């Protein structure tokens, strides 16, 4: 059967983890913030809730990311939950390059400055209310300071290494 | 910023939902979680959050390890189970005690990932559990419970 043990060692693997993970589905949100009048932002799926009181919520940013400076050097950000028709967004965001923001339409939240993709199902504005290393990445934490729900439209989802959507 | 314009937002981010467990001094302990993510592929981390007032929180607090159950469509019964808190939830439960940790480990659901507890730190009026994986196993090809704007559905 088993027996009373302690810290064990396993055996996974990186694509074990990998495949395994990928079978969590998630949202797709494009995360921004503007780092002395310069605009950042990249594709996130490690978004979730984390406090009611104060209202917290998280996402996850790799150490090796371009965004990752800007990030911790800024007080603030914002998040824009992708609508079912915004694959081309999400790609857009997830490529690493310099000026992301030419060719999109977006607008500047009212509390943070940060931009707001424009066909979003909703927007998120934060004040950064901690910050932790690990692994590989780094934790932020937002105090949610502003919302809002723009349109009714389906959220698209990342699932399995793909996009799909919602029954 | 109000309880219902945060909740409300935030419940237009999908969510699979999954039942997260631990051993402690063999007594076994679980709740339904949405707030599952990976965080560092080198070292392999996930996280979840658990709130402070759950009657669970003491044992993962003092237990070095967890684990997580991916659920599939048809484990709605299941999911509102282990959100109802109550002792003793694993009594007519289907489950296998993890190999490498001991945590229940739930029958049907997709995927099994076991952890030890790498990290954790205060947030607000939760806990965020951070955990290095350790094993894994993809266990049938059936489609996961996604949770949306306060509601259970499917993927299309
Ligand atoms: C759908 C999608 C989600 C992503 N999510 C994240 C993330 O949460 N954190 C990160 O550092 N990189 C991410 N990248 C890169 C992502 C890329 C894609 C395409
Ligand atoms: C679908 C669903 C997800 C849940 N997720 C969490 C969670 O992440 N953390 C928590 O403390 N309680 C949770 N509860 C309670 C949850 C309950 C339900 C029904
Ligand atoms: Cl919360
Ligand atoms: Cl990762
Ligand atoms: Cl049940």
Same mark, same amino acid.
């Given at each position: ?55 917290? =919520?998280?996402? !996850? ?6 965004? =990752? ?44 400055? !940060? ?53």
């Amino acid at each position: 059967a088993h027996h009373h043990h302690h810290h064990m060692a396993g055996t996974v693997t990186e694509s074990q983890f990998k495949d395994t993970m990928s079978r969590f589905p998630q949202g797709v949100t494009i995360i921004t913030t503007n780092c002395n009048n310069e605009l950042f932002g990249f594709t996130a799926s490690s978004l979730t809730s984390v406090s009611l009181k104060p209202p917290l =919520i998280l996402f !996850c940013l790799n150490k090796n990311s371009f965004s =990752i400076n800007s990030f911790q050097k800024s007080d603030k950000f914002a998040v824009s939950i992708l609508a079912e028709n915004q694959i081309d967004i999400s790609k857009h965001f997830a490529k690493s390059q310099p000026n992301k923001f030419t060719k999109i339409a977006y607008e500047l939240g009212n509390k943070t400055n !940060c931009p707001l993709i424009n066909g979003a199902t909703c927007y998120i504005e934060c004040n950064k209310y901690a910050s932790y290393d690990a692994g590989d990445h780094v934790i932020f934490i937002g105090e949610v300071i502003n919302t809002a729900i723009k349109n009714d439209l389906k959220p698209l989802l990342y699932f399995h290494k793909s996009y799909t959507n919602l029954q």
